[PDB]
């Protein structure tokens, strides 16, 4: 009933603009969910960097890697959208700043890297949602090429719900401790990406945190964030779109505004 008036209206919303909506919403305090196309696939596009940040810091954590040492790349030809890593070629960057630069600018240099050395590559990535008990989430290609969005291509793709359960495992859960899951967190709050997107979708003192993503193919656009409003539990949305037509536009203020919807879903 609260669901299917917030259903109602995402439907009005992916007609309007002539494509395909996929939600998912937590409130951690309550339980609360509400979904919507929640369990059909949607291309990752940039978002799964967010997760390859975490699974650098799980490696920190375990100490099969430190947060600290240098990474050298001085003769790699960086993919483009490298606006990081191309500033710091000469000097090499550490590790957390080059994941976190993955994370907050959407780094294709700084994606490319970490899964090459450190995270065995695709098929690594998808290795390590598994092991957080994502099953859904599959990676294939590497970061320029994984932007396609083709329909029904099923190449890097997860659902919003998926995203949903994972981060909440990963922000709020129980993957790393007390100490790097602040890292991982004040990582998501720093994002400078999603402005006009989930982040438009919330009053101006709540705290948020998201990774965004656009193929750029498809309108295919995406947000995920986890949400602190003032004096209340934390908020999990997921919101992933495509568009009918190859040479469409993503849009941001549609992924906003199905973001009120489905806050107000949970409330
Ligand atoms: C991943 O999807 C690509 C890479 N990451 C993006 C992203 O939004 O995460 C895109 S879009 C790009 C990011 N900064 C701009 C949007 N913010 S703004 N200027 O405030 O509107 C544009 C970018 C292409 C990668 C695979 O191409």
Known sequence: ????????????????????????????????????????????????????????????????????????????????????????????????????????????????????????????????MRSIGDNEFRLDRWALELNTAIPGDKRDTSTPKAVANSLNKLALGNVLNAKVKAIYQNWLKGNTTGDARIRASVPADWVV??????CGAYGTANDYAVIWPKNRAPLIVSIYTTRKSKDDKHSDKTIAEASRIAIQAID
Request: aromatic share 10%; net charge neutral.
């Open 1 to 128: 009933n609260k669901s299917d008036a917030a259903a109602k209206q995402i439907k009005k919303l992916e007609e309007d603009f002539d494509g395909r909506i996929g939600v998912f919403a937590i409130d951690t305090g309550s339980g609360n969910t509400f979904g919507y196309r929640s369990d059909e696939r949607f291309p990752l596009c940039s978002s799964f960097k967010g997760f390859l940040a975490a699974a650098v810091l799980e490696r920190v954590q375990q100490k099969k890697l430190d947060i600290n040492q240098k990474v050298k790349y001085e003769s790699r030809d960086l993919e483009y959208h490298s606006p990081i890593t191309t500033k710091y070629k000469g000097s090499g960057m550490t590790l957390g700043d080059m994941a976190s630069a993955a994370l907050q600018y959407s780094d294709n240099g700084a994606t490319n890297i970490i899964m090459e050395r450190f995270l065995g590559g695709p098929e690594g990535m998808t290795k390590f």
């Open 209 to 214: 945190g998201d990774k965004t993503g656009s």
